[PDB]
C-alpha cells in the first residue's frame, strides 16, 4: 500500500468510534 | 459382486493374508523343538487358521481390496446368513429373555412381598416364566390383541402438565 | 482444632507458592523455548537451578564406606556414587546424578 | 513503525485504562 | 443355603458363569463363525 | 447498596463477589432487569442487533485492510499454486532472534501470520487482483458500521422509536426479509458476478471507474426484452481457460454446464451467475404472499430457538457442500484452510443447533402458557413427551451399545493377529446413493449409471445438458466430490447418528421436563436457569433445565469431534494419495488412535525441541495450551462450591490477621464461585480447550505435509 | 433475602420448624378449624436458603417451599 | 437482656471466630445457664467448660447459635439458651424465643406469616405474570 | 514430557496389536474408556437422570411390567464415589498398560 492510506483508514475509523461510543452511552441509558 | 466386491476364492489380498499368517508362525515354530510342546500348539494355531480361511472361501464372501470380508445388509438372499439370518436367530433369543422377565414381574407383583422376590428370585415362578417365555411370538400376539399388554394413559403415572 | 484456620491458610499458601515457583517453571521453558530463547530458560545450559541440597547427601552417603561406616566393603547403594555394576550386557545400577531438571520435579 | 506503537497500547495500556474505569464503576455506590 | 443361592448377586453370577461358557465352548468346537454358511 | 449492576437492583444489595460476576451474567438478558417494559424490551433487540451488525463490519474490515496492508496479495494472484497467504504480520516484543527468522515465512521480510480463512481465495473470485481493491472495501465496511452504530442510537430517540406494534407484525415482515433481503441482495449479488467478477475470470479490468462503459456481453440486454434469452449461453470458458486472463475464455455469462472449473477445481462464475438469479427469482416470488400464531408472535424466546435452528441446520449446510462442491478458486489445494473450513462451520453449527433447544427451553419455562395453549401441536408434543423421550432413550442406547461393540469387536480380533475376521459392513445404502447420482465405480446400475433411464435422458423437453458437466466430475478421482466410501464410513456415520440422537435426547429432555416433573413437580417456579432444589427427595444436583443444556454441550463437542475427525483423516488419505490407511485402519478403534492423532502429531508436536525451532512452535504451544485450559475445566466440573466457600472462609481469616495486609480492605466479600457459575465456568474452559486443541492439531498436522 | 412460603396442604407436623438450623420458622394455631396448626415463617431474613425445611416435610410434594432470591450477608452464611 | 458483661466460659483460644464483621455490624450472643461445670463443643473449635453462670458466648452468626444451642439442649438438657443480636453497631434484640416459647410448641398470638391458602400445583404459570410485579409464588 | 516421553514411549503400546503384547494395547484403549466414562458420573449430577429415568419407568408401566424395586438414580455421594472409582481405575490401568509394554520390549 501507499502511507498515507494507513493514516486515512485510522482516521474513517474515529467516526464509528464516536458513534459506538455514542451508542452504547445511549443503550446503558 | 455388488460394490466391486470380487469374491474372496478369487480375490489374491484375501489369498495373500493367508501367505503372511502362516509365515508369521513358521518362523515361530522353526526355533522350538520339533517334538516339544510349543511346537504341537503352534501347528494348532497354524491349522486353525487354516480352518477359517478355507471357511471364509467355500462360505462365498466378499473381499474387498483389502481382502477382509465384508458383509452387505441391504438384506439380498444371496447374502442372507450376514445379517438377516443370525438377526432372526438373535431375535427370538433376546425376546425370549424379555418376554420371560416380564412374565416374571407380572406374576411376582400380585404377592403379598413383591420387593422381596426380586431379590430372591423364586425358582418356581422363574421357570415358570421361561416356559411362558418360549411362546412368545406367539403368546405376544393374543396378548397384543387382548388389550392387555399396553396400559391406558389413565393409569399410568405422569410428571405435570 | 483450635488453630486450624493457621493451619490450612499456611497450607494454602504453600501449595500456591509450590504451584507458582515449580509448574511456572516448566510454563516458562515452555514459552521460552516456544519463542526461540532457549537461553532465557532454567536448564543446564541456562539459568541453573541445581540441587545442592540433594547433591551434598549424594556426597556424604557415597563417600560413607570406610570413613563413618568403616567396616563397609562398599556403599549403601551404587545410587549415590561408585561404579558402573554391569551384569551381562546391561547395566544393574549406576550412579544417578542430580541436575536442573531433577530440581524441577522434586518441586513438583 | 505503526505496529511497534500500537500492540503496546491496545496491548498494555488501553486495558490498564478500561481495567480502571471499570473497577471504579464496580465499586462506586449512590 | 437353597434360599441364599436364589437371591440376586449369586444367580446373576452361576447364570452369567453358565451363559459365558455356553458361548466359550462353542468358539472352540465351531471356531470362527462371522456369516450363516 | 452499589449502582452496579444497574439491570437487577436486587443484584446491588449483595455485598459479596456474586455481584460482578452475576452483573456480568444477567447482563444482556433484557427481559429480567428490573421496571421493563415489552414496549421498552424490544427496541433494546433492535438497537443491540445494530451493535451487532456493526461488529461484523468492522471484523470484515479488519481482514481486508490486514491483507491489504500485511498480506500478500497481489504476489499470491499470480501464483496460487506455490505462494501462501498472509494473515497479518506479527510484532510481538517476546520473539527471540532465531524465532523471528522462522516467523519470515512465505518470503517475506517481517514475522508473519500464513492464513488459514481462505478468505484471499473468497476474494479472488469476487473479482479482486490488487492489494488498493481490498483496501477500498475496508474504507467501506468503517461507513457501514457507521451507519449501524448510528441507526441503532437513532432508532432509541423518542420520536424515532419503533413502535411496539411495528415489531410483533411477522406479516410484512416475512414479505421484505425474503423479498428484499434474500431477493434483491441475491439479484445484487447477480449483478456482481456478470458484470465484475465474470470479466475478471478472464482477464478483463471492471472497477467502479470504468464498469458503466464495458457491458458484461457483446449483446447486452437487447435480447433480454424480446424473450431470445439463449444467447447468453454461447461459447463458454472452455478447458483451455486458465481462471484471471483471456488464455481462451468466453463471452456467456449465464450458462449451466455443471460441474467443476478444470485447472482451479472450483465452480464455473457462470454457474453461480445463473445460480442466484433463479434464488432471486424464487424469492421475489415468495415475498408477495402475505392459537399457534398467538404464540410464536408473543414468545421471543420461540422465533430465537426457530432461528438457531435454522442457522444451525444452514451451517452445516455450507460445510458439508463446500468441502465437495468448492465455490471458490485454488480452495480444494489449499488443503489446510478445506480443512479449517469444515471444521470451523461444523462446530458453530453444534453451537446453534444446541441453542435451538436452550432458547425452546428458556420459552416453555418463561412464555409458554398451557391455559391459552391447549390442543395445538405444541401443547400434544408436552402431552405425550415421556414417549419421546423413552424412544429417544432406545436409539441412543441401541446405537451406543451396537456400533461400540462393533468397535470392540474389530479390535480383539485386529489385536488377536487376526484381521480377516472383523464384522465389515460394506455401506451399501449410501453406495447406492451415489451410484444414483452417477458414481459408475460400485457398479449398480440404476438411475444416472443407467444412461437409458428416464431421469437422465429427460423424454418431455430433451433438458439434461448438466450432467455432462457433472458426469465428468463424480466419475473422476480427482476430488472430493461423492468420496468412495467403504466399511469404515460405516462405522462412523453411526457414531455420528449416536451423537445426534444422544444430544437431542439430553436438550429434549430438559425441554420437555422444564415445567415438572414427580421429583420436581413446580420446575416453572423456580426458573430456566437454578443449581437444585436440595437434598431432599433424593438429591436433585443438575436437575434444571439449565443443567440439560449444560451437558449436551459435552454432547455436541464429542459429535462435533467424531465427525471433523473422520472428516479430516479422511481427507489425510485423499490428500496424500494413500487412501488405502483410512481403508484398513479406521474399521478398529486403534488405527483411530494410532495412525491418526499418534501418527499425524508429530510434527506438531516438534515444533519446539531443544535442537531448534519451526513455525509450527505457535501451533505446538497452542496446543499444550488448549490442553491446560481443557484440564482446568475439570476442576470447577469435578470439585463443587462448599469445598471453596470453607477454604475462603480460612484466606479471610489469614488475610484479616497478617500485619501490613491487615489494613487493605476488600469492597467486596470473598466468595466462592456459585454452583450454576462454575458449571459455566467449567464449561467454558472445557469447550475452549476442546475448540483450541484441535484447531492447533488440524492446522499443523496438514500444513507440515499438504 | 430468600422467600419461604408455607402451603395449606400441612398438617401441623412440627418437622419443618425443628429442622431449622437458623431458627426461621415456627407454629402458630390455624384460622378455620382453631385446633391444627401450620408453619410460619416471620424471620424471612435470617433464611440461608439450606431446604432442610423441605427434607422434613412428611406430605406428598412438601407443603413448604424455599425460592432462593437475592443474597445478603445472612442468607450467603457469610462468618465475615 | 444481653446481661453484658456475664462470664465468657474458661476456653482461651479459637482462631476460628468473631472476626471483623462483629465490630461493623451484627454479631449475635447466646446466653444460658449451665448445671455444671462441663465441657461443651464450640461451633469455633471444641472446648470451653460451661460455668456455673449467667454464662454468655459472643458468637458470630445466627447458625452457630442455633447449632450450640442444640448442643444445650441434647447433651445437657439445659433448653434456658436465649440468643440476642447486638446494639449500636448490631441490629435486633432478643432473636429467640421471639414469643417467650421455643418455636415447634403452639403459641396463640402468632400470625401466619408467608402462609398460602393454596397448594403448590394451583400456582400460576409464569407466563400469567410476566411482565409484572407479581411473582409466581406470592398471594 | 508430551513429545519425548508419553508419544515416545507409547510407541510400544499401539505398535502392540499382532504381537504378543497385544493386551496391553487393549488394556491400553480401555482404559482410557473407563476413564473418560469415568466422567459422565462426576461432571452431572443425580437430579438430571432420576427424570431421565422418570421417562424409562413409563416406557416400562406402559406395558405394565415395571418392577416393585423402584428404580432410582444413583446418590450424590454414590454417583462421586462410582465416577472416582472409574477415574482411577481408567489411569492406573492406562499407566499400567503403557509401563508394562514399554519395558517389557525395551529392557
Ligand atoms: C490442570 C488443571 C488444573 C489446574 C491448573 C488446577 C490448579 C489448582 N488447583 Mg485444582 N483441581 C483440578 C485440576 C487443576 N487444578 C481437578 C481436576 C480437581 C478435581 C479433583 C481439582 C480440585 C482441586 C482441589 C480440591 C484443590 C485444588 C487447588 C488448586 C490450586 C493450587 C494452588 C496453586 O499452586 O496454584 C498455582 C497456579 C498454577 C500452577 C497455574 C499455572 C499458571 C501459571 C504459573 C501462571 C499463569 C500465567 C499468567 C500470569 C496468567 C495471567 C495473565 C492473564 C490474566 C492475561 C491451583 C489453582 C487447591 C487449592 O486451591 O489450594 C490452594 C485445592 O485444595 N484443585
Ligand atoms: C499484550 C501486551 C504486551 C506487550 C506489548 C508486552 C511487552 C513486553 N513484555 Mg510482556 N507480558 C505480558 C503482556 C505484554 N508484554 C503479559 C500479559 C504477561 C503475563 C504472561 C507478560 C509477561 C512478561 C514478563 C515476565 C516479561 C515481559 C517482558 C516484556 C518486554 C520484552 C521486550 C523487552 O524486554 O524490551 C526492553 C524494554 C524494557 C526492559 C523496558 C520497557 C519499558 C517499561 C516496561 C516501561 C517504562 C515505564 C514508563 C515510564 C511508564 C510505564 C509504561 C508501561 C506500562 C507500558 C516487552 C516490553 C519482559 C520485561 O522486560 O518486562 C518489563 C519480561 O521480563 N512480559
Ligand atoms: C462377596 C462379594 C460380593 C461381590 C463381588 C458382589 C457383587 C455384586 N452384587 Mg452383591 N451381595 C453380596 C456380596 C457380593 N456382591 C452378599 C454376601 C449379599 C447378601 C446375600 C449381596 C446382596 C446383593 C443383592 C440383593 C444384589 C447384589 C448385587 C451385586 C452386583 C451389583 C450389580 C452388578 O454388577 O450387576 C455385583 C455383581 C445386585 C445384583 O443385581 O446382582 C446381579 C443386587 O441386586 N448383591
Ligand atoms: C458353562 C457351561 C459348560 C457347558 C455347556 C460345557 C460343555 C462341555 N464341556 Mg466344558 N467346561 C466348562 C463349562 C461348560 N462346558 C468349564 C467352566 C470348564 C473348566 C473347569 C470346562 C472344562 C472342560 C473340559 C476339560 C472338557 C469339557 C468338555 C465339554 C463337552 C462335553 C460334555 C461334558 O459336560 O463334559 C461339552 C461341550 C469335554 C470335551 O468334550 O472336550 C473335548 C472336556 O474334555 N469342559
Ligand atoms: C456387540 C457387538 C458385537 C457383535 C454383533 C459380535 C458378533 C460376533 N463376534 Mg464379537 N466381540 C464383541 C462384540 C460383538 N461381537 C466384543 C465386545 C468383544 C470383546 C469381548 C468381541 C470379541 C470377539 C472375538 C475374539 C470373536 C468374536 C466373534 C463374533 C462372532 C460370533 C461367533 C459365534 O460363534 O457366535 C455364535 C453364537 C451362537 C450360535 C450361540 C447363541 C446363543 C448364546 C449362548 C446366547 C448368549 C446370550 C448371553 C459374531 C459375528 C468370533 C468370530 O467368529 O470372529 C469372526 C470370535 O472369534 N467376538
Ligand atoms: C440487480 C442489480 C443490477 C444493477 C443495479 C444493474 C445495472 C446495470 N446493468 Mg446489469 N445485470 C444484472 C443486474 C444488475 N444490473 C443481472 C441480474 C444481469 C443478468 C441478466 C445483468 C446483465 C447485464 C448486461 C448484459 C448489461 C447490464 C447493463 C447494466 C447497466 C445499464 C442498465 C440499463 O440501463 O438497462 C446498469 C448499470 C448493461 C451495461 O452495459 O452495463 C454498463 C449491459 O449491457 N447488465
Ligand atoms: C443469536 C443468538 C442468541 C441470542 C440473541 C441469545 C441471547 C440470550 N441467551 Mg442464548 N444461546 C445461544 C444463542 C443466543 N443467545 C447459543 C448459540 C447457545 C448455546 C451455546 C445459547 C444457550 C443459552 C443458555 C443456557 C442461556 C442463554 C441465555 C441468553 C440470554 C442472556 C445471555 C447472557 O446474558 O449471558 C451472558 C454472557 C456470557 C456470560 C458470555 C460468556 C460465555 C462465553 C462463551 C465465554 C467465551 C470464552 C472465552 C472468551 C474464550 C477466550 C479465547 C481463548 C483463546 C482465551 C440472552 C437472551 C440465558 C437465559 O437465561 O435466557 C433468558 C441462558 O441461561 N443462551
Ligand atoms: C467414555 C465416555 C462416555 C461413554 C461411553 C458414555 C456413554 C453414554 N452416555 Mg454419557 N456422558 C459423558 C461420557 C460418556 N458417556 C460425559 C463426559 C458427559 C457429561 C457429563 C456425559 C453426559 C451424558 C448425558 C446427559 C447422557 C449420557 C448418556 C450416555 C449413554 C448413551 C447411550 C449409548 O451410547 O449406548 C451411554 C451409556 C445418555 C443416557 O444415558 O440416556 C439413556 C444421556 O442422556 N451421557
Ligand atoms: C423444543 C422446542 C423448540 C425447539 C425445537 C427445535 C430446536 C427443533 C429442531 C428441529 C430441526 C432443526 C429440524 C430439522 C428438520 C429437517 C428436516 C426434517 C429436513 C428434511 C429434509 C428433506 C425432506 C430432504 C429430502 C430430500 C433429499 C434428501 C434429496 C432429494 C429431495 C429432497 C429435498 C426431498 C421450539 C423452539 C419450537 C419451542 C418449543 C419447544
Ligand atoms: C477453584 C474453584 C472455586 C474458587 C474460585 C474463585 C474463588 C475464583 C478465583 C478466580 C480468580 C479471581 C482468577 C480468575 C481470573 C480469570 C482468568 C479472569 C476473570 C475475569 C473475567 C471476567 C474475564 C469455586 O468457587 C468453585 C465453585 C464451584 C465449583 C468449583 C469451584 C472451583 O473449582
Ligand atoms: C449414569 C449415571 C446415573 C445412572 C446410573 C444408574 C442408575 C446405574 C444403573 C446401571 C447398572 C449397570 C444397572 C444394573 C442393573 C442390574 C444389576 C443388571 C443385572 C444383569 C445381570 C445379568 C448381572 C446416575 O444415577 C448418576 C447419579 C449421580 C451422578 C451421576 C450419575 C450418572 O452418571
Ligand atoms: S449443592 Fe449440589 S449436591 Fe449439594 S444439595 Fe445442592 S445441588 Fe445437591
Not at chain 6, 65 to 80: C, I, L, R, T
Not at chain 6, 394 to 409: I, K
Not at chain 6, 512 to 525: H, N, T, W
Not at chain 8, 100 to 118: H, I, T
Amino acid at each position: 500500500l501507499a502511507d498515507g492510506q494507513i493514516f486515512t483508514a485510522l482516521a474513517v475509523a474515529l467516526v464509528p468510534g464516536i458513534l459506538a461510543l455514542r451508542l452504547a452511552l445511549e443503550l446503558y441509558k | 459382486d455388488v460394490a466391486g466386491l470380487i469374491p474372496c476364492s478369487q480375490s489374491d489380498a484375501f489369498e495373500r493374508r493367508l501367505k503372511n499368517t502362516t509365515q508369521r508362525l513358521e518362523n515361530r515354530l522353526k526355533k522350538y523343538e520339533p517334538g516339544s510342546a510349543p511346537a504341537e500348539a503352534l501347528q494348532k494355531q497354524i491349522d486353525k487358521t487354516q480352518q477359517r480361511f478355507d471357511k471364509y472361501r467355500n462360505s462365498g464372501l466378499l473381499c474387498g481390496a483389502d481382502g477382509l470380508p465384508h458383509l452387505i445388509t441391504d438384506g439380498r438372499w444371496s447374502h442372507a446368513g450376514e445379517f438377516t439370518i443370525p438377526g432372526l436367530l438373535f431375535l427370538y433369543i433376546a425376546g425370549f429373555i424379555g418376554w420371560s422377565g416380564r412374565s416374571y414381574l407380572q406374576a411376582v407383583a400380585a404377592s403379598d412381598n413383591s420387593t422381596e422376590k426380586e431379590i430372591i428370585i423364586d425358582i418356581p415362578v422363574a421357570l415358570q416364566s421361561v416356559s411362558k417365555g418360549f411362546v412368545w411370538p406367539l403368546a405376544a400376539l393374543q396378548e397384543f390383541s387382548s388389550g392387555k399388554l399396553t396400559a391406558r394413559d389413565e393409569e399410568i403415572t405422569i410428571s405435570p402438565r | 482444632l483450635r488453630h486450624r484456620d493457621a493451619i490450612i491458610s499456611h497450607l494454602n499458601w504453600v501449595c500456591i507458592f509450590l504451584g507458582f515457583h515449580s509448574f511456572g517453571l516448566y510454563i516458562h521453558n515452555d514459552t521460552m523455548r516456544a519463542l526461540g530463547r532457549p537461553q532465557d530458560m532454567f536448564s543446564d545450559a541456562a539459568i541453573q537451578l541445581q540441587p545442592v541440597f540433594a547433591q551434598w547427601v549424594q556426597g556424604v552417603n557415597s563417600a560413607a564406606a570406610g570413613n563413618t561406616a568403616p567396616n563397609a566393603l562398599a556403599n549403601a547403594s551404587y545410587a549415590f556414587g561408585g561404579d558402573i555394576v554391569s551384569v551381562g550386557g546391561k547395566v544393574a545400577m549406576m550412579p544417578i546424578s542430580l541436575g536442573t531438571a531433577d530440581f524441577l520435579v522434586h518441586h513438583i | 513503525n505503526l505496529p511497534s506503537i500500537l500492540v503496546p497500547m491496545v496491548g498494555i495500556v488501553l486495558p490498564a485504562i478500561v481495567m480502571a474505569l471499570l473497577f471504579v464503576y464496580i465499586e462506586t455506590d449512590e | 443355603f437353597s434360599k441364599y443361592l436364589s437371591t440376586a448377586p449369586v444367580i446373576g453370577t452361576l447364570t452369567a458363569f453358565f451363559l459365558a461358557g455356553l458361548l466359550i465352548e462353542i468358539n472352540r468346537f465351531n471356531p470362527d463363525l462371522l456369516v450363516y454358511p | 447498596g452499589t449502582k452496579f449492576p444497574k439491570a437487577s437492583q436486587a443484584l446491588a444489595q449483595d455485598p459479596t463477589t456474586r455481584r460482578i460476576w452475576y452483573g456480568i451474567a444477567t447482563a444482556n438478558d433484557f427481559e429480567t432487569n428490573d421496571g421493563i417494559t415489552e414496549e421498552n424490551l424490544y427496541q433494546k433487540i433492535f438497537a443491540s442487533h445494530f451493535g451487532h451488525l456493526a461488529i461484523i463490519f468492522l471484523w470484515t474490515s479488519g481482514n481486508l485492510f490486514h491483507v491489504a496492508w500485511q498480506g500478500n496479495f497481489e504476489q499470491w494472484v499470480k501464483d496460487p499454486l506455490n505462494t501462501r497467504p498472509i494473515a497479518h504480520a506479527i510484532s510481538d516484543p517476546h520473539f527471540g532472534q532465531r524465532a523471528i527468522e522462522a516467523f519470515s515465512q512465505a518470503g517475506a521480510s517481517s514475522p508473519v501470520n500464513i492464513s488459514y480463512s481462505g478468505v484471499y481465495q473468497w476474494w479472488y473470485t469476487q473479482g479482486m487482483r490488487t492489494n488498493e481493491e481490498l483496501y477500498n472495501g475496508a474504507i467501506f465496511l468503517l461507513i457501514l458500521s457507521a451507519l449501524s452504530l448510528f441507526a441503532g442510537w437513532l432508532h432509541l430517540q423518542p420520536k424515532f422509536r419503533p413502535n411496539l406494534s411495528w415489531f410483533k407484525n411477522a406479516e410484512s415482515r416475512l414479505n421484505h426479509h425474503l423479498g428484499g433481503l434474500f431477493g434483491t441482495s441475491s439479484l445484487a449479488w447477480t449483478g456482481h458476478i456478470v458484470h465484475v467478477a465474470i470479466p475478471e475470470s478472464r482477464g478483463q479490468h471492471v472497477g467502479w471507474d470504468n464498469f458503466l462503459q464495458v457491458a458484461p456481453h457483446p449483446a447486452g440486454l437487447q435480447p433480454f426484452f424480446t424473450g431470445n434469452w439463449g444467447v447468453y449461453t454461447e461459447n463458454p470458458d472452455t478447458a483451455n481457460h486458465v481462471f484471471g486472463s483471456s488464455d481462451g475464455a468466453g463471452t456467456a455469462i449465464l450458462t449451466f454446464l455443471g460441474g467443476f472449473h478444470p485447472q482451479t477445481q472450483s465452480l464455473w462464475l457462470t454457474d453461480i451467475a445463473h445460480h442466484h438469479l433463479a434464488i432471486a427469482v424464487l424469492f421475489i416470488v415468495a415475498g408477495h404472499m402475505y392459537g399457534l400464531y398467538d404464540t410464536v408472535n408473543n414468545s421471543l424466546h420461540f422465533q430465537l430457538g426457530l432461528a438457531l435452528a435454522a442457522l444451525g441446520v444452514i451451517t452445516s449446510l455450507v460445510a458439508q457442500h463446500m468441502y465437495s462442491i468448492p465455490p471458490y478458486a485454488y480452495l480444494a489445494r489449499d488443503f489446510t484452510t478445506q480443512a479449517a473450513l469444515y471444521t470451523h462451520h461444523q462446530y458453530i453449527a453444534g453451537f446453534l443447533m444446541v441453542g435451538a433447544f436452550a432458547h425452546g427451553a428458556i420459552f416453555l419455562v418463561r412464555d409458554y402458557d398451557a391455559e391459552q395453549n391447549k390442543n395445538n401441536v405444541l401443547a400434544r408434543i408436552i402431552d405425550h413427551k415421556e414417549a419421546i423421550i423413552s424412544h429417544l432413550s432406545w436409539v441412543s442406547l441401541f446405537l451406543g451399545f451396537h456400533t461400540l461393540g462393533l468397535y470392540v469387536h474389530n479390535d480383539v480380533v485386529q489385536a488377536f493377529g487376526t484381521p480377516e475376521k472383523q464384522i465389515l459392513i460394506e455401506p451399501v445404502f449410501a453406495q447406492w446413493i451415489q451410484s444414483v447420482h452417477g458414481k459408475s465405480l460400485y457398479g449398480f446400475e440404476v438411475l444416472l449409471n443407467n444412461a437409458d433411464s428416464i431421469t437422465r435422458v429427460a423424454p418431455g423437453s430433451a433438458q439434461p445438458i448438466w450432467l455432462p458437466g457433472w458426469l465428468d466430475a463424480i466419475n473422476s478421482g480427482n476430488n472430493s466430490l461423492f468420496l468412495t466410501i467403504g466399511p469404515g464410513d460405516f462405522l462412523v456415520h453411526h457414531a455420528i447418528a449416536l451423537g445426534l440422537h444422544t444430544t437431542t435426547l439430553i436438550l429434549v429432555k430438559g425441554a420437555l421436563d422444564a415445567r415438572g416433573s414427580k421429583l420436581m413437580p413446580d420446575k416453572k417456579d423456580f426458573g430456566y436457569s437454578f443449581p437444585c432444589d436440595g437434598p431432599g427427595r433424593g438429591g436433585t444436583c443438575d436437575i434444571s433445565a439449565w443443567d440439560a443444556f449444560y451437558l449436551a454441550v459435552f454432547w455436541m463437542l464429542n459429535t462435533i469431534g467424531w465427525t471433523t475427525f473422520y472428516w479430516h483423516w479422511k481427507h489425510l488419505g485423499v490428500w496424500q494419495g494413500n487412501v488405502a490407511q483410512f481403508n484398513e485402519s479406521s474399521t478398529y478403534l486403534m488405527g483411530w488412535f494410532r495412525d491418526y492423532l499418534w501418527l499425524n502429531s508429530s510434527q506438531l508436536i516438534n515444533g519446539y525441541n531443544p535442537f531448534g525451532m519451526n513455525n509450527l512452535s505457535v501451533w505446538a504451544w497452542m496446543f499444550l495450551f488448549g490442553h491446560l485450559i481443557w484440564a482446568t475445566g475439570f476442576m470447577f466440573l469435578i470439585s463443587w462450591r462448599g469445598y471453596w466457600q470453607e477454604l475462603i472462609e480460612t484466606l479471610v481469616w489469614a488475610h484479616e490477621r497478617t500485619p501490613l495486609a491487615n489494613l487493605v480492605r476488600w469492597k467486596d466479600k470473598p466468595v466462592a464461585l456459585s454452583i450454576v457459575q462454575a458449571r459455566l465456568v467449567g464449561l467454558a474452559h472445557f469447550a475452549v480447550g476442546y475448540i483450541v486443541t484441535y484447531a492447533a492439531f488440524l492446522i499443523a498436522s496438514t500444513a507440515s505435509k499438504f | 433475602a430468600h422467600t419461604v412460603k408455607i402451603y395449606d396442604t400441612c398438617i401441623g407436623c412440627t418437622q419443618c420448624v425443628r429442622a431449622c438450623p437458623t431458627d426461621v420458622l415456627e407454629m402458630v394455631p390455624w384460622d378455620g378449624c382453631r385446633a391444627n396448626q401450620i408453619a410460619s415463617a416471620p424471620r424471612t431474613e435470617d433464611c440461608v436458603g439450606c431446604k432442610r425445611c423441605e427434607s422434613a416435610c412428611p406430605t406428598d410434594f412438601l407443603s413448604i417451599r424455599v425460592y432462593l432470591g437475592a443474597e445478603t450477608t445472612r442468607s450467603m452464611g457469610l462468618g465475615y | 437482656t444481653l446481661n453484658l458483661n456475664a462470664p465468657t466460659p474458661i476456653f482461651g483460644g479459637s482462631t476460628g471466630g468473631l472476626l471483623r464483621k462483629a465490630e461493623v455490624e451484627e454479631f449475635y450472643s447466646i446466653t444460658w445457664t449451665g448445671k455444671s461445670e462441663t465441657v461443651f463443643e464450640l461451633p469455633t473449635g471444641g472446648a470451653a467448660i460451661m460455668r456455673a453462670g449467667e454464662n454468655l458466648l459472643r458468637l458470630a452468626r445466627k447458625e452457630q447459635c442455633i447449632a450450640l444451642g442444640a448442643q444445650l439442649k441434647d447433651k445437657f438438657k439445659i433448653t434456658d439458651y436465649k440468643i440476642y443480636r447486638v446494639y449500636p453497631s448490631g441490629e435486633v434484640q432478643f432473636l429467640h424465643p421471639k414469643d417467650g416459647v421455643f418455636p415447634e410448641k403452639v403459641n396463640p398470638g402468632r400470625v401466619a406469616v408467608g402462609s398460602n391458602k393454596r397448594r403448590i400445583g394451583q400456582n400460576p404459570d409464569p407466563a400469567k405474570l410476566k411482565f409484572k410485579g407479581q411473582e409466581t409464588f406470592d398471594s | 514430557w508430551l513429545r519425548d516421553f508419553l508419544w515416545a514411549q507409547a510407541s510400544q503400546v499401539i505398535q502392540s496389536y499382532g504381537s504378543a503384547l497385544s493386551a496391553y494395547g487393549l488394556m491400553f484403549l480401555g482404559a482410557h474408556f473407563i476413564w473418560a466414562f469415568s466422567l459422565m458420573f462426576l461432571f452431572s449430577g443425580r437430579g438430571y437422570w432420576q427424570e431421565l429415568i422418570e421417562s424409562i419407568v413409563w416406557a416400562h408401566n406402559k406395558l405394565k411390567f415395571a418392577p416393585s424395586i423402584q428404580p432410582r438414580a444413583l446418590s450424590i455421594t454414590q454417583g462421586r464415589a462410582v465416577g472416582v472409582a472409574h477415574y482411577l481405575l481408567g489411569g492406573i490401568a492406562t499407566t499400567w498398560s503403557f509401563f508394562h509394554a514399554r519395558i517389557i520390549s525395551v529392557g
